[PDB]
Design a protein around this ligand. Structure first.
Ligand SMILES: Nc1ncnc2c1ncn2[C@@H]1O[C@H](CSCC[C@H](N)C(=O)O)[C@@H](O)[C@H]1O
Ligand SMILES: Nc1ncnc2c1ncn2[C@@H]1O[C@H](CSCC[C@H](N)C(=O)O)[C@@H](O)[C@H]1O
Lengths: 209, 209
């Protein structure tokens, strides 16, 4: 079995996705609309950047890696909500539509296809590490790592592997389950470009062209 | 001169960027807001997808290639407006803010930095080919090309080169100045992922890590 159970698992860690009530209407928290409200636990609405997750998901789900069936995505929010993304999910290109979809997800706990019974988005049980397959390395990503890795040299020939990419406005990926941390550039990148780069490198090594 | 005048020039061709008047307010045309208005020349407001240009510009301007000084970007709109992007321009991550910026650009014909006299966006004279440097190959991109090219094999060692990427909702890059057309994948990609892939390939060949 030279294919084995190979696939890339990306966790978007610290994603800024959460709902707030304004008047009678529920909206996705957003630092352009909601700087003047107050949050539980002293959290800062000025850091609410759901656009980072939107743009990262667009790159991940568009990727040839995804449409070849070699990608799985999870989202782990700053409120400790774990979301599984069905590989069939088309993320809306429109930011406002994306936000409405996330409000529905966080309220109902899943979103089903309108043309079938299949859940395309689902809130699942923490920790995300319980959902990884056996024989799987776990790698976190950070600009702060002083040596830069070539991503193609990190791709296993026949194993599944997890990469954790931060989806916060500011911070550093720091989770219990990673076995190492890598930098992939001497420049600080967007999460979305990081995702495009990871998928591109895996596509090359696994022969998705 | 082993560096020469090398750099990557990307033209976003057929970008959906134009202003409409609704009431007393000018807005960027958008197929979610404006399907019920009428346009000059029988054009279809349902095809107005400025998000494609927004997301492509985010990938281009974030790229290590751009911050190493090896990228130039032009935008050529469906209304035949040619826009030069200063390499220093930070494209807003917020779609609504991006749209307001484009309205200002299309009205005033430039946008200056707020902290200096430098124009960061400017409407310039067609044709875009008059603005390319000497010794420059011109390549268009399309999924319809039956043979797929490895992008790294297209990167010249020491010359400038132009890549034309469609920024329309639907269509095919078809311009007078390209010398060849290439596919870079067996999958139809987003413009934005195409841009991430081009910049990534050029970064590798030109040693931007
Ligand atoms: N040079 C680098 N090496 C490895 N990972 C990087 C990187 N630059 C960025 N990243 C990844 O991308 C994230 C960027 S920081 C968080 C996202 C960012 N605020 C945004 O607007 O997109 C990091 O958490 C890290 O996971
Ligand atoms: N396999 C492929 N090979 C080469 N270029 C491709 C490609 N897939 C997409 N492109 C480029 O990306 C554009 C996608 S079509 C226009 C953009 C698209 N509607 C979007 O939503 O982003 C094409 O015009 C072409 O320039």
């Amino acid at each position: 079995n030279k294919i084995g159970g190979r696939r890339l698992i990306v966790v978007l860690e610290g994603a800024s996705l959460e709902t707030v009530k304004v008047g009678k209407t529920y909206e996705l928290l957003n630092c352009d609309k909601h700087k003047s409200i107050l949050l539980k636990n002293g959290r800062d609405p000025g850091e609410a950047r759901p656009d980072i997750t939107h743009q990262s998901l667009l790159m991940l789900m568009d990727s040839p890696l995804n449409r070849a069936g070699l990608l799985q995505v999870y989202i782990h929010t700053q409120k400790n909500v774990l979301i599984e993304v069905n590989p069939q999910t088309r993320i809306p290109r429109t930011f406002d539509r994306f936000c409405g979809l996330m409000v529905q997800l966080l309220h109902k706990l899943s979103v089903r296809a309108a043309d079938g019974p299949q859940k395309l988005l689902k809130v699942i049980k923490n920790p995300v590490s319980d959902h990884f397959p056996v024989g799987c390395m776990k790698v976190g990503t950070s600009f702060s790592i002083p040596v830069v890795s070539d991503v193609r040299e990190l791709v296993p020939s026949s194993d599944p592997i997890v990469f954790v990419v931060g989806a916060f406005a500011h911070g550093k990926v720091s989770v219990e389950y990673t076995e190492k941390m890598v930098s992939i550039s001497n420049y600080p990148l967007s999460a979305a470009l990081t995702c495009a780069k990871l998928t591109t490198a895996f596509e090359e090594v696994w022969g998705v062209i």
